[PDB]
Amino acid sequence: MEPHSLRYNLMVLSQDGSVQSGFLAEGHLDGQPFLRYDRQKRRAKPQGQWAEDVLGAETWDTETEDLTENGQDLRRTLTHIKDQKGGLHSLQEIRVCEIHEDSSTRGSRHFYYNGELFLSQNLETQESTVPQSSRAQTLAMNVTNFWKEDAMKTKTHYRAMQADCLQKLQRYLKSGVAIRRTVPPMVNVTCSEVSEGNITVTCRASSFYPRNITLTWRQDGVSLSHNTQQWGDVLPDGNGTYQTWVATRIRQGEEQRFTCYMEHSGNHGTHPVPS
């Protein structure tokens, strides 16, 4: 429905015509922050005891080594992007990892210069996408030429980049840093619009995380034709969790035949119509 992802936000800058040392960086897992680089103490640190109490130094050592390498390359591309130039200059790289359900993966790398995109790389196919802008094409052409020669891009060491956060993504999911935020949905079935030989039944799942959920009514066991029911967007219900519902109209007296089948986070549950 929505896959697992590992995102990093890297940034280098220069405030007076001199690229500042180090860099800035953020790591988010499935939408949530877990890493934050300390430019001064030169360490990758957790963004909470949550990440602090689950991840060990082995992880922070690795992320610190990796990100630092990242920072050198970025600072080097920036030096090049200006020729001397002066004043403010900024270069950010958003890199993302994705694992879907079919186990197919995705991976991208986006580069912004002074607040504007100018290059995107699909790490799974290695094709790049430059915005159809003049200034953005000049940039892309320079930065890419510069990468192939005196090569701090190097081959498909990019294909390794993809396998790298992917391995980390899998590792972090395994460590559980993301599963602790799991909240099984509160189920609640309601009978409404009681009327002319009819009565509506509504299955409401609320206060649950993550967002991926499946809900459907069943007549004696079979899923109702996708139409004969009405679903609601998966709206943010409350305080970080989500909510949604499905409904369908039935004939008064045959409540026993209907059940609401739900699936959330690998957990399948069955809910009957109220008495």
Side-chain angles (χ1 to χ4, degrees), residues 1-148 151 156-191 193-229 231-248 250-275:
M1 306 152 260
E2 188 169 0
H4 292 300
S5 79
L6 175 50
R7 190 208 334 141
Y8 295 93
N9 291 278
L10 259 296
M11 183 177 285
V12 294
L13 60 165
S14 78
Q15 306 178 190
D16 244 299
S18 309
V19 174
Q20 187 192 80
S21 65
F23 54 98
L24 308 171
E26 245 175 356
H28 304 63
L29 192 68
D30 280 11
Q32 297 289 46
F34 79 109
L35 174 159
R36 182 128 161 181
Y37 184 71
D38 191 311
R39 192 189 149 292
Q40 293 173 296
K41 310 188 187 180
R42 332 237 151 167
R43 288 280 300 175
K45 293 187 173 178
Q47 232 174 298
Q49 290 186 184
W50 332 15
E52 173 152 281
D53 282 302
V54 171
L55 300 180
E58 191 172 0
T59 290
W60 304 119
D61 286 353
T62 310
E63 281 285 4
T64 291
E65 293 180 44
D66 286 347
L67 295 183
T68 289
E69 161 134 24
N70 271 304
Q72 287 171 46
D73 295 317
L74 266 330
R75 282 198 308 278
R76 187 162 183 160
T77 304
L78 215 215
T79 295
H80 180 60
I81 287 170
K82 44 192 215 171
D83 208 356
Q84 33 185 342
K85 266 162 148 190
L88 265 301
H89 288 293
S90 182
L91 180 55
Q92 176 198 40
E93 179 200 327
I94 302 180
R95 172 190 296 152
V96 186
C97 240
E98 286 181 51
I99 292 176
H100 289 271
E101 158 171 289
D102 43 26
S103 303
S104 73
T105 61
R106 306 268 184 286
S108 42
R109 215 166 158 234
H110 300 73
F111 303 79
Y112 311 77
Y113 172 60
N114 275 1
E116 293 179 276
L117 179 77
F118 70 88
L119 187 58
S120 281
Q121 295 172 169
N122 181 314
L123 302 181
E124 221 75 69
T125 62
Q126 233 59 284
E127 302 171 305
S128 301
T129 298
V130 182
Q132 298 302 313
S133 188
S134 167
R135 106 179 193 81
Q137 293 180 305
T138 303
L139 267 167
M141 193 187 65
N142 288 159
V143 178
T144 45
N145 293 327
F146 168 83
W147 280 343
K148 76 150 70 183
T156 323
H157 94 306
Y158 285 118
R159 206 123 166 56
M161 206 136 271
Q162 172 57 37
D164 214 330
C165 65
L166 272 178
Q167 185 252 294
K168 294 174 176 177
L169 211 200
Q170 293 160 0
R171 193 185 186 85
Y172 294 156
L173 288 172
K174 180 179 303 184
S175 79
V177 189
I179 203 79
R180 53 151 283 242
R181 291 175 177 300
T182 300
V183 178
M186 293 298 318
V187 185
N188 168 59
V189 182
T190 54
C191 300
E193 357 212 330
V194 51
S195 172
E196 253 178 85
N198 311 320
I199 56 168
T200 295
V201 292
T202 295
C203 190
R204 298 182 185 286
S206 61
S207 303
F208 61 76
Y209 190 76
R211 172 184 171 67
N212 307 311
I213 197 178
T214 289
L215 277 184
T216 181
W217 279 101
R218 287 185 162 189
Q219 187 165 227
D220 287 325
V222 188
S223 293
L224 263 52
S225 79
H226 206 293
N227 96 237
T228 295
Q229 307 184 65
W231 292 266
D233 283 288
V234 168
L235 271 18
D237 172 298
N239 319 67
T241 64
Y242 294 75
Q243 74 177 252
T244 176
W245 51 265
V246 65
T248 193
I250 72 188
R251 241 47 178 216
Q252 323 189 77
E254 50 166 44
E255 300 17 288
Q256 275 109 46
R257 307 182 64 182
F258 295 79
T259 49
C260 178
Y261 183 87
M262 179 174 85
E263 186 289 303
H264 187 267
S265 299
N267 194 57
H268 298 224
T270 287
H271 308 78
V273 166
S275 284

